[PDB]
Design a protein around this nucleic acid. Structure first.
Ligand code: ZN
Ligand code: ZN
Ligand code: ZN
Lengths: 45, 1174, 68
RNA sequence: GACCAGG
DNA sequence: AAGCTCAAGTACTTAAGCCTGGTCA
DNA sequence: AAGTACTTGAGCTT
């Protein structure tokens, strides 16, 4: 399972694959993903 | 002026919850949203649906020698009203509160902004019960921030709390997430009977003449149609009209006698009431009268029955009800609509025929309808209402035809009183009209049974590319006159002919093909869209000494007065001018009373009215006092001089009013009006180009058309914008030179470019031929640092074939997944890691079919390292569905790379040429390396001396801490602007002409002559790397001819020919020609028969023997069958099994594949070319 | 967005020289000459912290993780 | 392939 | 008569290159 | 719109 964000209400919703996407409190129909901890390098140029 | 910053910062930190800070942006968007508000309120749709009428069906028992066929069960149904509810959640209630749907979810869910459209249906059962019923009619769009959106009047706090950007302007229909918009088009003037001379008229009707009279009449509900008079050489005039894409041609005397039960003497004394027996008119009217007496009838009844029996077939009216009222119906529907009363139609038609004869009489000039004089604007909402009225008329006529079919079958179920019957009928027919609207807004094909008097049927809608704020505005302001005139090649109406002064901008209109057509409205020219009440106007006119003659009378001296299409009376022309004067004074006085303390009664004369006094003059425009009061026109404000208060006027008063443009230019006894400030003349985008009055107008035109494409800040709400390609300029800043209107419109929220210390100098040597340089240190310390956003979407819904249910899903199907790149990028859900850098050959989303159970892949088809910022799992709909759409927003980064065009604000678009190192640049006595070197040889031959002035202004403003006001027309000839800015500079310490001493960089000694250093605003452009470079070493080919494809997305090749051929074949390079045109593109080895000379006839031999030798091709056409004994050598066999003998003359010739394709298609035309070889 | 640290033409650092510039217009009743008290004598490093739009404070009021 | 864009 | 040059009148294809984007059914 | 060459019918002469 993953973690997302309700677009309007902003609540972690923990949906599992092959599911009905919706905000479990809002009824909204859009979810952003959240950026996890990840090690990326960028040159200072 | 000074930089408003403390106000800017305080508005930024906590947005103003009281009122949207910059009101003039709203007054700029006003046209569209006000047209839509006038749709919903002010009774626009209602009048329309009422004027459709009622539509009928019934059981036909044939007349059979009776004539009056009996019919009992007749239903004529009628539409009460139309309702457009607020856009609620998806149509049905779904286990939650039916909540509002702001446009945010419209733009993210990548779907349109729809709302329920309800109709009120009524009955007639050949009686009077008139029971009604509310009908769901599908879903229609709604203009953001209209009287039907959930954002109107919401204060910017409540906007930023939602997902729109603070100074949202609204005005755009959203469709699938691409904000489509209805461009304003230009139409002939409403109700004003104009004249025409255009050659087609006569040679269409050979007895006809170019002399014609056109009038565009419009009902109160804005459902206009045009009916024109075509005059013919004989003397008669035919009364053109157009119905259902069908022309129609009736004589004027006919319709005139049909209208009123009249005496022909009344006809004549109405035509030539004057100066009794003026020879020309009194003979032409005699000829017309005899010509109509020829084959016509006498009475109104007889004529009406003539016309009715004529038209009954094409008119979609009830097949039965009558024939006399059919005549009173045709004169109700087509002849003259804007006039309600019959007698008034009669008077006006007499006016019209008199004016037309005058036009042939040479006493009236040829009106030039292709001028902003006789032109008007069709707003968006009015066209929307008219198309909705038309789709509703179609819907009614369609269910009418359906019930007629039910009556036609035999009589399957026939009880016109029973409701179950009608719910069945409604079940059968398509009951959705909203999707027709949404398709319209998606593409623009206005498909209606009648064109509604609009020439071109297509192109009405344009996407509102938010690329940069100026482009957003100039989408909202602009107009366009139509492709029909565009296709014609002439220096005509594409000319900026001057009756537009303050109506539609003279400078700003794009370069290229549409140049001169789309004229963006001036800064202040509104579009008056809310009509007014004007009955008090006839009251006051007849109170003012002018009375209409009930007894038929008319003299020479008297002229005509008309209130936007209605004969009110007649007047002597001096009285006409005095009436115009007193009326205009009354208008201004009561308006300036309505603003301040005095209470508001119903406005006697509405301010929007433009009193159209047409003076008389020989060989001049025909004089009729024109009191216009309708919306869908242009209206601009000025200050009145005899009073001291506002006054507005439209595109008649310009040509006849002495409008002084400078308070000091005023000459008494003539000048009746004074302009506020001539800044009010230009458009919005053109206005904000400092010193716009020092440049050669082509350069101001370039800078206008090219500022509309700056890589600037497209707003501030970018987290919630799913648009396709967005550009954001990381570090933009306010111009040090800025016309105060640039602060008033509040651009400071939306900067476009940066401020560069530009030293005009030709030193690097690279910066010639209009290019420039870019100081490398500034280029790496963060000069215009572009960021592109490409939001691409993935939709499993489309890729499923058909039949089986929803199959594919996102993620890693139960089973293994590759480690090498997949598990690196894609997290676990098939959705990529947030922020991981992507390179072209790498996956972005992972989806798997259920049957094969094997994960598929889609890689990042862009050819440039992009990042990932946000991935949106677009839920399908109301709910209860899987994630069937992802939206990945890739954040490409684009620093200034050699080739990335830059531009000052005067038309000096260039290239960043070399990025000269910072230490090898020039420098002054102070130490500032000039950041960007422009070229001196570029200022003559372009006349952008305004730029040098801008340099002065900037070096003045930056020093002290001022914001130099650079509106056009401030600085006059007495004291130059140069002198003022120079006084400023010499105050600051630097040279007075702007010069500065600069030592060179690579030699260390000073430049003999000083150099120029200014502080300009370089709004970076948008053409850098995407456009530029495509290389094709080897790649995909064409299905047909094996020539490389036409791409840059499919590695497509570049075209070389049809002039490139002439170039080389002049160079005398036959080998280069044969190489490029043949060798590199399409090369082949093909066999031909030398005996027969055919190329289709070659077949390679099959099953000759075992492995043995190679397949030696042969020719079928020159080979004979295998019957008979022959030697084993020459024989060979066929795939089907046939053996043959002959056809051995097969050689191996090179031949371009396209010729093979030509042989194929040619022989398909049954003709084949026989090529020889020797 | 944020103030362009290390102004373009010259090399002076002006990052920290905005939040102390803004509270001069704010509460000192001075005009654009206020920045002269900051130690900016040129006019390249002066057209940076004078005419810079701080367009972040209008953009940070858009958290998707609002929790409201 | 068609309609708006753009160099 | 009827042969035969004369007249307006009816059908009928072109309108610079490229290149790049987008939306669309 | 521009303009081309194309083709048919009506009026005059042997
Ligand atoms: Zn929610
Ligand atoms: Zn052969
Ligand atoms: Zn500096």
């Amino acid at each position: 399972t993953m973690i997302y964000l309700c677009a309007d209400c902003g609540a972690r919703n923990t949906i599992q694959a092959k599911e009905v996407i919706r905000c479990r409190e809002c009824g909204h129909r859009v979810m952003y993903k959240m950026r996890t901890k990840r090690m990326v390098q960028f040159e200072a140029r | 002026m000074s930089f408003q910053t403390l106000e800017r910062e305080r508005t930024f930190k906590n947005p103003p919850k009281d009122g949207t800070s910059f009101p003039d942006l709203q007054k700029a968007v006003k046209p569209h949203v006000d047209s839509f508000n006038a749709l919903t309120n002010a009774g626009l749709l209602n009048y329309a649906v009422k004027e459709i009428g009622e539509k009928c069906a019934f059981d036909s028992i044939t007349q059979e020698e009776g004539g009056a066929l009996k019919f009992g069960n007749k239903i004529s149904f009628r539409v009460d009203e139309v309702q457009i509810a607020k856009p609620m959640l998806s149509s049905r209630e779904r286990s939650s509160i039916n909540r509002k749907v702001y446009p945010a979810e419209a733009r993210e869910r990548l779907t349109t902004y729809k709302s329920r459209l309800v109709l009120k249906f009524s009955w007639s059962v050949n009686g009077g019960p008139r029971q009604s019923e509310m009908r769901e009619v599908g879903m229609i769009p709604i203009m953001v921030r209209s009287n039907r959106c959930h954002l109107e009047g919401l204060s910017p706090a409540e906007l930023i709390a939602h997902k729109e950007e603070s100074e949202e302007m609204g005005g755009y229909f959203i469709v699938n997430g691409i904000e489509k918009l209805i461009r304003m088009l230009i139409l002939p003037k409403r109700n004003h009977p104009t004249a025409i001379i255009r050659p087609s008229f006569a040679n269409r009707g050979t007895s006809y003449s170019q002399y014609g009279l056109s009038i565009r009449c419009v009902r109160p509900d804005q459902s206009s149609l045009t009916n024109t008079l075509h005059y013919l050489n004989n003397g008669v005039t035919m009364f053109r009209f157009h119905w259902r894409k069908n022309e129609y041609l009736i004589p004027s005397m006919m319709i005139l006698k049909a209208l009123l039960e009249t005496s022909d003497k009344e006809i004549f004394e109405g035509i030539v009431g004057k100066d009794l027996g003026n020879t020309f008119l009194t003979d032409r009217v005699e000829l017309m009268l005899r010509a109509y007496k020829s084959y016509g009838l006498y009475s109104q009844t007889e004529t009406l029955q003539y016309l009715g029996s004529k038209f009954r077939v094409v008119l979609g009216v009830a097949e039965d009800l009558t024939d006399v009222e059919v005549g009173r119906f045709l004169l109700q529907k087509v002849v003259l609509v804007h006039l309600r009363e019959a007698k008034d139609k009669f008077r006006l038609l007499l006016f019209m025929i008199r004016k037309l004869y005058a036009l042939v009489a040479g006493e009236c000039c040829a009106d030039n309808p292709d001028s902003p004089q006789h032109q008007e604007i069709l707003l968006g909402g009015f066209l929307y209402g008219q198309i909705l009225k038309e789709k509703i008329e179609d819907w009614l006529n369609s269910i009418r035809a359906q019930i007629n079919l039910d009556v036609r079958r035999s009589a399957p179920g026939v009880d016109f009183s029973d409701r179950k019957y009608l719910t069945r009928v409604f079940s059968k027919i398509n009951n959705d009209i909203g999707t027709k609207l949404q398709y319209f807004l998606s593409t623009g094909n206005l498909v209606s049974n009648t064109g509604l008097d609009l020439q071109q049927a297509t192109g009405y809608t344009v996407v509102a590319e938010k690329l940069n704020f100026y482009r957003f505005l100039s989408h909202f302001r602009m107009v366009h006159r139509g492709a029909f005139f565009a296709e014609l090649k002439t220096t005509t109406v594409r000319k900026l002919l001057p009756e537009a002064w303050g109506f539609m901008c003279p400078v700003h209109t794009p370069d290229g093909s549409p140049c001169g057509l789309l004229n963006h409205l001036a800064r202040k020219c509104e579009i008056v869209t809310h009509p007014s009440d004007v009955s008090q106007i006839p009251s006051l006119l007849l109170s003012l000494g002018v009375d209409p003659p009930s007894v038929v009378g008319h003299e020479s001296g008297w002229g005509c007065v008309q209130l936007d299409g209605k004969i009110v009376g007649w007047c002597t022309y001096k009285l006409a001018k005095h009436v115009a004067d007193v009326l205009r004074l009354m208008k201004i006085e009561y308006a300036v009373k309505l603003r301040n303390g005095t209470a508001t009664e119903p406005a006697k004369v509405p301010l929007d009215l433009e009193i159209g006094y047409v003076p008389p003059s020989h060989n001049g425009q025909y004089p009729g006092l024109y009191l216009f009061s309708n919306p869908a026109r242009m209206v601009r404000p000025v200050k009145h001089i005899s009073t001291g208060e506002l006054d507005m006027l439209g595109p008649f008063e310009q040509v006849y009013m002495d409008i002084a443009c400078f308070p000091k230019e005023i000459v008494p006894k003539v000048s009746t009006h004074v302009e506020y400030s001539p800044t009010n003349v230009l458009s919005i985008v053109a206005n904000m180009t400092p010193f716009s009055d020092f440049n050669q107008s082509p350069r101001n035109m370039y800078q206008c058309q090219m500022g509309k494409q700056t890589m600037g800040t497209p707003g501030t709400a970018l987290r919630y914008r799913t648009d396709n390609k967005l550009y954001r300029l990381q570090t933009g800043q306010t111009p040090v030179v800025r016309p105060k209107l640039h602060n008033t419109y509040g651009l400071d929220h939306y900067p476009n470019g940066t401020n560069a210390v530009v030293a005009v100098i030709s030193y690097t040597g690279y910066d010639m031929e209009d290019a420039m340089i870019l100081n490398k240190s500034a280029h790496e310390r963060g000069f215009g640092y572009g960021t592109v956003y490409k939001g691409e979407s993935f939709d499993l819904s489309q890729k499923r074939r058909r039949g089986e249910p929803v199959v594919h899903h996102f993620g890693f199907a139960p089973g293994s997944t590759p480690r090498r790149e997949w598990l690196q990028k894609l997290d676990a859900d098939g959705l990529p890691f947030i922020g991981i850098k992507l390179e072209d050959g790498d996956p972005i989303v992972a989806y798997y079919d259920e049957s094969t159970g094997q994960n598929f892949i889609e890689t990042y088809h862009g050819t440039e390292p992009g990042f990932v910022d946000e991935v949106r799992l677009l839920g399908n709909d109301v709910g209860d569905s899987e994630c069937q759409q992802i939206h990945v927003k890739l954040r490409i980064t684009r620093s200034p790379i050699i080739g990335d065009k830059f531009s000052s604000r005067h038309g000096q678009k260039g290239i960043c040429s070399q990025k000269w190192p910072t230490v090898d640049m020039p420098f002054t006595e102070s130490g500032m390396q000039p950041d960007i070197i422009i070229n001196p040889h570029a200022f003559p031959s372009r006349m952008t001396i305004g730029m040098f002035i801008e340099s002065l202004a900037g070096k003045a403003g930056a020093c002290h801490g001022l914001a130099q006001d650079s509106t056009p027309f401030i600085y006059s000839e007495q004291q130059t602007a140069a002198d003022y800015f120079g006084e400023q500079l010499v105050k600051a310490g630097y040279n007075y002409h702007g010069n500065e001493p600069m030592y060179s960089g690579i030699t260390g000694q000073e430049m003999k002559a000083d150099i120029y250093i200014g502080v300009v605003y370089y709004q970076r452009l948008r053409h850098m790397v995407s456009d530029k470079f495509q290389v094709r070493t080897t790649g995909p080919i064409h299905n047909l001819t094996r020539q490389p494809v036409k791409g840059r997305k499919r590695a497509g090749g570049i075209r070389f020919g049809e002039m490139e051929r002439d170039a080389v074949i002049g160079h005398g390079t036959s080998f280069l020609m044969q190489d490029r045109l043949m060798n590199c593109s399409d090369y082949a080895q093909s066999w031909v028969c030398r005996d027969c000379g055919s190329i289709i006839s070659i077949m390679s031999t099959i099953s000759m023997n075992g492995v043995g030798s190679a397949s030696e091709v042969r020719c079928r056409s020159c080979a004979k069958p295998a019957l008979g004994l022959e030697d084993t050598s020459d024989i060979w066999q066929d795939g089907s099994g046939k053996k043959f003998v002959g056809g051995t003359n097969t050689t191996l010739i090179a031949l371009p594949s396209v010729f093979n394709y030509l042989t194929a298609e040619l022989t398909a035309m049954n003709i084949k070319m026989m090529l020889e070889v020797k | 967005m944020i103030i362009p640290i290390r102004c373009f033409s010259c090399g002076k650092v002006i990052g920290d020289k905005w939040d102390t510039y803004l509270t001069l217009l704010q509460e000192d009743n001075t005009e654009g000459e206020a920045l002269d008290k900051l130690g900016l004598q040129r006019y390249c490093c002066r057209r940076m912290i004078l005419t810079h739009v701080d367009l972040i404070e209008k953009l940070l009021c858009y958290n998707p993780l609002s929790k409201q």
